[PDB]
Structure 1
C-alpha cells in the first residue's frame, strides 16, 4: 500500500495552543522512516499553512468559527488530492475539529466510506447543543446528513455538505458524553461501544461487531479518526481532555491491528496530541510514542511479528 502524510498544525477548535505541535513531535519521533520500514511507499505532503484569521469573533457561543472552518476546508482539499493519488491519507493533528475536513475530503473520492471513531467523546455536539463552544467537540454533527437542518449557517462552514450517514459510523471508547450528545446517539440509532461495552464484551468481540456492522453488506473504504484521549491518560497523558478509565495500550493496538487486517483502511486521523500538556518530559515521550505505535499498527506493524516474503533460514 501507498501512504500520504499531511501535517495539520491547527488548534483553534479548542483553547490550548500546543496541539499545533502534534505534527512536529510525531515526525521528530521518526514516524516517516518507521512507516518506510513497513509495506509502505510513503510521501510527505508537508504541513498545511493555516493563515491567521484575526477577525473571528464567536458565532453565538461557538468559538473561532472562521479559523476552524477554513482549516478544515483546506484540509479537505489536501486529503482529496492524496486520495486521488491512490494513497492512504495520514493526517497528523491538530485538534479534532479537523476531522470535518479530513472525512469530507476522503468522502469526495470515496463517497461510500465507513467511519470508526476512537475517542472518550462523541464529538457530536451541534453549535446549538455545545456547552463549551469548542469546535473540536462538534465535528461529527457537521458530517451527518441526518443532522442537516440542525446545524445553523456558521461562518466558515458554508462549504460543508454533510455526506455521511449516521448508519455508517461506529464509536469505540466513549466515557464522557454530553446529555445532548447522548440524545443524538439514541435518536439516530448510532452504533457505539462505550467503555461499558468494551468491559462487557472484550475488545475482541467489539472489533468483530464493529467490522461486521460496517462491512457486512459490502466492502467499502474505512476512515479511522483516532483521538488519542480515547486511550487511558496513563498512556496518552499529554492531551487536552483526558478522561480516566480509558482503552489500554493493548486495546489500542488491537483495534488498529484488526483494522489493518481488513485491507480497507483508506484514511486515518491521529489527533489531539498536545506536548505542552505533558507534566514531565516522560509524559510527552509516552504520549508521542503511543501515538506512533497506533499509527504503525494501522499500516501493518503486528505484535506477533512481521517478515518479508523471503526464506529467512536458507
Structure 2
C-alpha cells in the first residue's frame, strides 16, 4: 500500500517527557525498512520540527494549549499534503493530542472519512470536563461537530473546524472512561466496543460490526488512531497512561489485519510510545516491537503469511 511517513516528536499534550522520542525509537527499530521489505511504497516526510513556545500559560485548567494547538496545526498541514500526494499518512507520535491535527488534515482532503479509535480511553474530555487539563485526553472533543458550542476558544486552536460527527467514529478497547466522557458517549450516541463488549462478542464480531457500522451505507476512507495503551501493558508498558485488562497482542494484530484487508485505510496514528517510561530496556523494546508489529499489519503483513504474484515452485 502506499505510505507517507510523518514524525511528530511532541509531548506537551501530557506531562511526561519522553513521548517525543517515539518517532526516533520507531525508526531505529527499522520501521521504514520493514515496510519496504513488504509490499510497500514508502516516502518519509521527515520529523516535523515543533519550535518552542515558551510563553504558554494554562488556559483555565488546560495545559500547554498554544503548544498543543500549533503542533496539531502544523501536523494537519503536513497530513493534507501526503494525502494530496496519494499516500496513506503514517503519523509516528508523540502524544495523542496530535490526533486533532492528524484527523483535521486528513479530512481536509477526505471529509467523508470514518475513524477507528483504538485506546483504553475515549479522549473526549472537553476543556470544561477535563480534570487534569492534559490535552492528550481531549482530542476527540475538538473534532466532533456535535460538541461545537461546548468547546471554549482555547489559544492555539482557532484554526480548528470540527470535521467528524458522532456517527462517524468507533472506539475499541475502552476501560478507563471519565463520567463526563461517558455522558458524552451515551448522549451523542457514539458507537463503542469497550473491553466488556470485546469480552462478550470476541474481537472477530467486534471488527465485523465496526466495519459494517462505518462502511455499510457505503465505502469510505478510514482513519485509524491507535493509542498503544489500548493494548495491555504486558505488551506496551512504556506508555504514559497504562490500564490493565487491555487488548491482547493478537487482538491488536487482528484489528489492524482486518483494517488492512478493507483496502480503505487512508490515515494512521501510532501514538503514546514513551521509551523513557519502560522500567527496563526490555520494556522499551517490548513496546516498540509491538508498535512496529501493529504498524506492519496495517499495511499488509499477515500472520497466515504473504507471497508475491510469482510461482514459487519456480
State the Cα distance separating 1:186 from its structure 2 match: 0.1
Matches within 5 A, 1:34-113: 34-113=34-113
Look up the SS of the partner of 1:269 in the other structure. strand
* Greater CA drift, 33-42 or 285-294: 33-42
Cα-Cα RMSD: 0.3
1:201 to partner: Cα distance: 0.1
Q: Alpha-carbon deviation of 1:2?
A: 1.2
**The residue matched to 2:116 in structure 1 has which SS?**
strand
Q: Deviations over 1:194-227 (max 9, x none)?
A: 0000000000000000000000000000000000
The superposition leaves residues 87-136 of structure 1 with CA deviations (integer Å, 9 ceiling, x where unpaired) of 00000000000000000000000000000000000000000000010000
- CA deviations over 1:5-57 (Å, ceiling 9, x no partner): 00000000000110000000000000001000112110000000000000000
SS at 2:127's partner residue? coil
How far apart are residue 233 of structure 1 and its match?
0.2
State the match for 2:16 in structure 1: 16
Distance 1:171 1:37 in 2: 31
Residues in 1 aligned to 2:86 and 2:211: alpha-carbon distance in whole angstroms: 23
Q: Deviations over 1:263-294 (max 9, x none)?
A: 00000000000000000000000000000000
Distance 2:311 2:271 in 1: 39
Partner Cα separation in structure 2 for residue 65 and residue 77 of structure 1: 18
Give unmatched runs, 5+ long, in structure 1.
Answer: none
Secondary structure of the equivalent of 2:171?
Answer: strand
Partner of 1:313: 313
Query: Counterparts of 1:64 and 1:23 in 2: how far apart (Å)?
Result: 21
**Number of residue pairs aligned between Structure 1 and Structure 2:** 314
Give the TM-score taking structure 2 as reference length. Answer: 1.00
1:144-190 CA distance string (max 9 Å, x none): 00000000000000000001111000000000000000000000000
Residue 235 of structure 1: how far off its partner (Å): 0.1
Question: Displacement, 1:68?
Answer: 0.1
Matched, 1:4 2:29: no
Q: Distance in 1 between matches of 2:280 and 2:50?
A: 29
User: Any idea what SS the aligned residue of 1:67 has?
Assistant: helix
**Equivalent position SS for 1:33:** helix
| 2:233 aligned with 1:233 | yes
Secondary structure of the corresponding residue to residue 210 of structure 2: helix
In the other structure, the counterpart of 1:115 is: 115
For 2:29 and 2:39, locate their aligned partners in 1 and report how far apart those are by CA, in whole Å: 19
